Enzyme design. Structure first.
Site, PDB file in Angstrom:
ATOM      1  N   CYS A  19       2.968   1.649   9.866  1.00  0.00           N
ATOM      2  CA  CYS A  19       3.543   0.695   8.688  1.00  0.00           C
ATOM      3  C   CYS A  19       4.702  -0.353   7.479  1.00  0.00           C
ATOM      4  O   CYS A  19       5.704   1.024   8.410  1.00  0.00           O
ATOM      5  CB  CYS A  19       1.752   0.848   7.511  1.00  0.00           C
ATOM      6  SG  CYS A  19       0.524   1.642   8.329  1.00  0.00           S
ATOM      7  N   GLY A  60       2.327   6.107   9.754  1.00  0.00           N
ATOM      8  CA  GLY A  60       3.672   6.364   9.502  1.00  0.00           C
ATOM      9  C   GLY A  60       4.876   5.301  10.158  1.00  0.00           C
ATOM     10  O   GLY A  60       5.811   4.461   9.498  1.00  0.00           O
ATOM     11  N   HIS A 101       1.000  -0.960  -0.013  1.00  0.00           N
ATOM     12  CA  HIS A 101       0.051   0.074   0.043  1.00  0.00           C
ATOM     13  C   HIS A 101       0.616   1.288   0.277  1.00  0.00           C
ATOM     14  O   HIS A 101       0.158   2.331  -0.256  1.00  0.00           O
ATOM     15  CB  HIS A 101      -1.356   0.183   1.197  1.00  0.00           C
ATOM     16  CG  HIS A 101      -0.610  -0.002   2.325  1.00  0.00           C
ATOM     17  ND1 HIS A 101      -0.155  -0.585   3.253  1.00  0.00           N
ATOM     18  CD2 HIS A 101      -0.131   1.470   2.898  1.00  0.00           C
ATOM     19  CE1 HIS A 101       0.540  -0.198   4.258  1.00  0.00           C
ATOM     20  NE2 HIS A 101       0.517   1.146   3.921  1.00  0.00           N
TER      21      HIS A 101
HETATM   22  C1  LIG Z   1      -0.363   1.822   7.312  1.00  0.00           C
HETATM   23  C2  LIG Z   1      -1.422   2.359   7.676  1.00  0.00           C
HETATM   24  O1  LIG Z   1      -2.011   2.383   9.063  1.00  0.00           O
HETATM   25  N1  LIG Z   1      -3.061   2.758   6.818  1.00  0.00           N
HETATM   26  C3  LIG Z   1      -2.669   1.139   5.784  1.00  0.00           C
HETATM   27  C4  LIG Z   1      -3.584   0.988   5.788  1.00  0.00           C
HETATM   28  C5  LIG Z   1      -3.607  -0.600   5.457  1.00  0.00           C
HETATM   29  C6  LIG Z   1      -5.702  -1.040   4.382  1.00  0.00           C
HETATM   30  C7  LIG Z   1      -6.384  -0.417   4.891  1.00  0.00           C
HETATM   31  C8  LIG Z   1      -6.166   0.911   4.805  1.00  0.00           C
HETATM   32  C9  LIG Z   1      -5.187   1.350   5.436  1.00  0.00           C
HETATM   33  C10 LIG Z   1      -5.028   3.096   5.842  1.00  0.00           C
HETATM   34  C11 LIG Z   1      -3.967   2.927   7.211  1.00  0.00           C
HETATM   35  C12 LIG Z   1      -4.517   2.225   8.208  1.00  0.00           C
HETATM   36  O2  LIG Z   1      -5.116   1.143   8.317  1.00  0.00           O
HETATM   37  N2  LIG Z   1      -5.566   3.249   9.206  1.00  0.00           N
HETATM   38  N3  LIG Z   1      -6.789   3.320   9.704  1.00  0.00           N
HETATM   39  C13 LIG Z   1      -7.892   2.639   9.667  1.00  0.00           C
HETATM   40  C14 LIG Z   1      -7.745   2.605   8.016  1.00  0.00           C
HETATM   41  O3  LIG Z   1      -8.688   2.152  10.369  1.00  0.00           O
END
Ligand SMILES: *CC(=O)N1Cc2ccccc2C[C@H]1C(=O)NNC(C)=O
Ligand SMILES: *CC(=O)N1Cc2ccccc2C[C@H]1C(=O)NNC(C)=O
EC number: 3.4.19.12
Lengths: 304, 304
Positions: free
Chosen positions: A145, A143, A41
């Site tokens: 991830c 950040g 992603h």
């Molecule tokens: C890295 C990160 O926090 N992400 C990556 C990602 C992957 C899959 C779906 C959505 C996102 C956005 C974000 C989140 O996980 N943040 N919060 C959510 C979507 O609840």
């Protein structure tokens, strides 16, 4: 003596952390040999995450679109490929700090250390468990991830986790280092409810043995039980059913302490039915399930 | 989101760990620049520890009696001196892995990470607090002595603790890196009872703010209190008295959450008087006091 939720020394992993940027998205990468591993992603904008077609998005990307920075030095990207939910960026330089390593897909109930990172920089390390519902209860902000989970056996680092996302409930989901998610989760910004979070029974028993070894013995009783009687109690309290495999791995702790595994099960049964009655065990007022039998033996013997 | 008992990345400290042997006693040393720091009781046999005269014992020791091994390589000892309860072994080689560092004597209530080591080899890292009674509740087995505590500010490691001993109660005592014990403890195998272990009130309040930030809000009430009213409750429950200095350092958390420090004190007061009623806060069934206001801000913002 003393028993702590201990993480592995993170040095070997810190030397592998890099910052990966694609367009306006920045996250963490793991540099091992001449490859950088990161969540796929990284190619997405916030808008793309609602319903991404990773194959179509990745077509518009070239090697020069992936910026990989290791501290202050820039790595030259000479190849890129997608393997499940991770991107593999081939670079022209092997990481001189690459430790001996393996990639492992862990079982639910197993523990590991997480090196939380932001923009390729390590911020902290903590120990956690892969929940039976394939989520982890970590500490991850925007950040973080690409931050990884691992175990260490003397000089070998077994990478087992890469953080990808946070569910709307605040629990965390990610992949093994081949990019396969633990659990049914997909890398899409869509509500994905997690299943029932059960307690890891074999771990609670291992922690009860650690408590006896360290002097907290108030919970030992004059009773015993059977595997089937204990499992009736385990099911009522959303504990994982205990099997003879679990009893077998508790064998070294049962031998060291002289307390039969089924006698410890009867202590746990009474703790489940009566609670702690305002008391503590190893500084906790609840039953801890994030120590495996291997962790208890390791800590109670001083394995480096 | 999520809040974990996080330790600092230990890499910078792992590169400083060495094994120090004198006679038949082996423990951990800390190699920074051309000096190795270790507990002075390395010169003692088990028999000497009952009533050691360190000055008289150290006379019978020469530079060649101190064996310093950094992994597999041997360091040449060209000088030795005793500073309070630590020995300083001057070696002929500066540690190439010496990070930017300071030595700091921390205040009770402050937190730090411990890199538990055995025979110069790191085994694990955990976060703990210097208790108000100047003990720490760590995890140390035989051979862990000389393991150090530290904090990290970007690239600078502030060493604050060196483990020396375990009290007969199983709690731990040690020194700053100038060899001065925290608390009244002496490096002698004699029963040394520790004083009352009070709860670090400012830390519990910081952790309550971390809980609100992460969604655990059930404990917020419709009440407020005063510093003197709260301290009457704090004294009854063996909590440290709260001062305006403590309120001031909680200011950033009060500003971020919009909950006045005295309103949070009234939540804590009710939690002390009524208990948790079978509920949890950030995965804990008791009030956690090992996170400082600085730790909560650091973790809740992602400082690397
Ligand atoms: C890295 C990160 O926090 N992400 C990556 C990602 C992957 C899959 C779906 C959505 C996102 C956005 C974000 C989140 O996980 N943040 N919060 C959510 C979507 O609840
Ligand atoms: C390194 C260690 O564990 N020590 C060193 C030491 C220092 C001061 C007094 C006694 C000892 C022996 C030992 C312990 O602390 N072990 N357990 C005791 C004395 O309770």
């Amino acid at each position: 003596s003393g028993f702590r939720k201990m993480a592995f020394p993170s040095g070997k992993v810190e030397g592998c952390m890099v910052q990966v940027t694609c367009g306006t998205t920045t996250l963490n990468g793991l540099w091992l040999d001449d490859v950088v591993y990161c969540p796929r992603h990284v190619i997405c904008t916030s808008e793309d995450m609602l319903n991404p077609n990773y194959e179509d998005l990745l077509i518009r990307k070239s090697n020069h679109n992936f910026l990989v920075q290791a501290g202050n030095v820039q790595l030259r990207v000479i190849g890129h490929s997608m393997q499940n939910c991770v991107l593999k960026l081939k670079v022209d330089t092997a990481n001189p700090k690459t430790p001996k390593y393996k990639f492992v897909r862990i079982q639910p109930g197993q523990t590991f250390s997480v090196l939380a990172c932001y923009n390729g920089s390590p911020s902290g390390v903590y120990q956690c468990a892969m929940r039976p519902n394939f989520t982890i209860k970590g500490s991850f902000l925007n950040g973080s991830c690409g931050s990884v989970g691992f175990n260490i056996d003397y000089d070998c680092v077994s990478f087992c986790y890469m953080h990808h996302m946070e569910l709307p409930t605040g629990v965390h989901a990610g992949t093994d280092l081949e990019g396969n998610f633990y659990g049914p989760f997909v890398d899409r910004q869509t509500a994905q409810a997690a299943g029932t979070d059960t307690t890891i029974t074999v771990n609670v028993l291992a922690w009860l043995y650690a408590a006896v070894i360290n002097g907290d013995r108030w919970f030992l009783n004059r009773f015993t039980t059977t595997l089937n009687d204990f499992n009736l109690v385990a099911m009522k309290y959303n504990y994982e059913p205990l099997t003879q495999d679990h009893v077998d791995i508790l064998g070294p702790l049962s031998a060291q302490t002289g307390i039969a595994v089924l006698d410890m099960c009867a202590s746990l049964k009474e703790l489940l039915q009566n609670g702690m009655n305002g008391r503590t065990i190893l500084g906790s007022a609840l039953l801890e399930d994030e120590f495996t039998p291997f962790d208890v033996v390791r800590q109670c013997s001083g394995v480096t």
